[PDB]
Amino acid sequence: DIELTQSPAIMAASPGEKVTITCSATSGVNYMHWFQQKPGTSPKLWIYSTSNLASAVPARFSGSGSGTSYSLTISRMEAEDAATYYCQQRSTYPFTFGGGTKLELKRADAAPTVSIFPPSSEQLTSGGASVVCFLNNFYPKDINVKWKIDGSERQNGVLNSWTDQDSKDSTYSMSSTLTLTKDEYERHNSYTCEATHKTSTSPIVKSFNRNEC
Amino acid sequence: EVKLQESGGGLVQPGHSLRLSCATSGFTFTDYYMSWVRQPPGKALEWLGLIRNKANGYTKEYSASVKGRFTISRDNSQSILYLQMNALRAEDSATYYCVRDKGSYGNYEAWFAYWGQGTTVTVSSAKTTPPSVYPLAPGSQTNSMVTLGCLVKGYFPEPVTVTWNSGSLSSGVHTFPAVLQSDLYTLSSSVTVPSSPRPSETVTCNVAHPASSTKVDKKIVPRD
Ligand SMILES: Cc1ncc(COP(=O)(O)O)c(CN[C@@H](CCCCN)C(=O)O)c1O
DSSP states (O other), X not given: OOOEEEEOSEEEEOTTOOEEEEEEESSOOSOOEEEEEOTTSOOEEEEETTTEEOTTOOTTEEEEEETTEEEEEESSOOGGGOEEEEEEEOSSSSOEEOOOEEEEEOOSOBOOEEEEEOOOHHHHTTTEEEEEEXXXXXXXXXXXXXXXXXXXXXXXXXXXXXXXXXXXTSOEEEEEEEEEEHHHHTTOOEEEEEEEOTTOSSXXXXXXXXXXX | OOEEEEEOOOEEXXXXXXXXXXXXXXXXXXXXXXXXXXXXXXXXXXXXXXXXXXTXXXXXXXXXXXXXXXXXXXXXXXXXXXXXXXXOOGGGOEEEEEEEEEESSSOGGGTTTOBOOOEEEEEOSSOOBOOEEEEEOOOXXXXXXXXXXXXXXXXXXXXXXXXXXXXXXXXXXXXXOOXXXXXXXXXXXXXXXXXXXXXXXXXXXXEEEGGGTEEEEEEOOOOO
16 A cells, blocks of 8 residues: 655746656555646656656656655756646555646746626626626736725635636636625625735726616 | 547435446457546545456456445446446545556556546535526726626536637636535636627627536626
């Protein structure tokens, strides 16, 4: 029952930078295999039999080790190598995978393109109201969202979602939703989506005013 | 062309059973071992077991986390791989994958090279709920690119599927991971389009939730 532990758990690297992931086993295995998994798709074979590259893998990649210590190495980090890597041992039954390492890619700063939306007339009819706010394509990751209704900040009723580094432009995106009762919604009047990113010491905001029309 | 296609996934109550399948094609099924691997949302891959080829008497091997509960099997006449799951627990909730395991040679570079797209198994006592799909359109134009979206809430379980204008509109799209709350999911999808087209040229999001045989279309109309 060979348990494999991967480190680092998470990390970031600049282009051209050399990356190294390790995988230690509680017991000794004869080969360590590796897999590359980008979000939303099935894992791929990236390195087999410790040091053999899989179909189409770039030379900048390489693996090594033995006994209980193994590692995957990227000579010069490319933007496409961003993903989660999984080691695997098929040396003893049962086969096992490691905890995985989420390798992120770095890039130029990107201010979040923000957008806010009031509930739709459709939802209202249900007696529920949701204000949606998108903070799209920003880098870095770190982002803080705050909802202010008529000046007063609101916490209860907010739920957020964060996407994984975009595979097309390496940025990040976030969606924030403030769900209230149509009843509570119709009291207040101003709704603001306030976001603080390092791309501005000036808080980024977009808002709307509930207008009868 | 090597083809792996899993199915059968869906909602199942705790303590019950679910049988998954994996239709294969593009290679001689009998000559290969096959493995089942799962990955619960946001966590690691997990090997559950495998079944050997017909040279090896189609024997089976199992992970300790499911031995005694899960049975693997195959249809060598139709080339289908099967996973019999009985007495399902919360931990059994994940995306399941079939993999072409070893063969009677030394083509190691290909072992575990082929996986299926996966099928989501959700074990919960919660009741299947169709989603509600709402329009996400702007209120007030001084921009070149305009972003719209759709809000899909109160559905169960995963996964829903979203596309814009039947899919012809594939760029500038963002579908956010769903957020679970009170046994009900919610996710939104944003699409960005040049101020020119919309609202001139209609924009629609296509939402499909097979789990509750729900399929809706919401054209996003400006607020007037
Ligand atoms: C995909 C796969 N399936 C099955 C087996 C074992 O077959 P068996 O149950 O019939 O005995 C192995 C061996 N894995 C070993 C050796 C593979 C290396 C080949 N060069 C390892 O992964 O350390 C394997 O890699």
